[PDB]
Amino acid sequence: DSFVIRGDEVRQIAPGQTGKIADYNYKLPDDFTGCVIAWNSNNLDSKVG
Amino acid sequence: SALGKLQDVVNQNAQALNTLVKQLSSNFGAISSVLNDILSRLDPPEAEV
């Protein structure tokens, strides 16, 4: 599952972790197995203006 | 004090039942002794723990 989020949203992307965006966009199950790989993309996903 | 054995047996059974009922209302280190309040106050992970 590939997506783009903000900085503090990384914590909310976790099984059993509460959050407005996590509860509204993408939530992991309580018995989730697997994981998240997050990398900065300030030079690709950020544009002036 | 002539029927001591039967009275003692009955008292022991009643005391065991009462002790079990009282021990039902023990926290055992939890936040509260009632599960509904624990579910209401806590998030699913901590409430489950």
List the helices and strands and how they pair.
The structure is cut from a larger assembly and holds two copies of chain A (about 50 residues).
Chain A: H1 9-12, H2 20-24
3D structure, described in words:
Chain A: This is Spike protein S1. This is part of a larger assembly, with 2 copies of chain A (49 residues). With 49 residues, chain A is an all-alpha fold. The first copy, chain A, contains 2 helices and no strands. The longest helix of chain A is centred in the middle third of the chain and has 5 residues, at 20-24. The first copy, chain A, is elongated and about 40 Å long. The A-B interface holds A 16, 18, 30 and B 43-45, 48.
Strand portion of chain A, in percent? under 5%
Largest interface: A-B, 3 and 4 residues
Principal-axes geometry of chain A comes out as elongated
The helix fraction of chain A, in percent, is 10-25%
What is the end-to-end distance of chain A?
Answer: 29 Å
Could you give a short account of the major beta sheet of chain A? none
**Multimerization state:** part of a larger assembly
User: Could you tell me the number of beta strands of chain A?
Assistant: 0
Radius of gyration of chain A: 12 Å
Tell me the structural class of chain A: mainly alpha
Number of helices of chain A: 2
Give me the strand/helix succession of chain A.
Answer: HH
Protein name (chain B): Spike protein S2'
Organism (chain B): Severe acute respiratory syndrome coronavirus 2 (2019-nCoV)
Coiled coil (chain B): 7-49
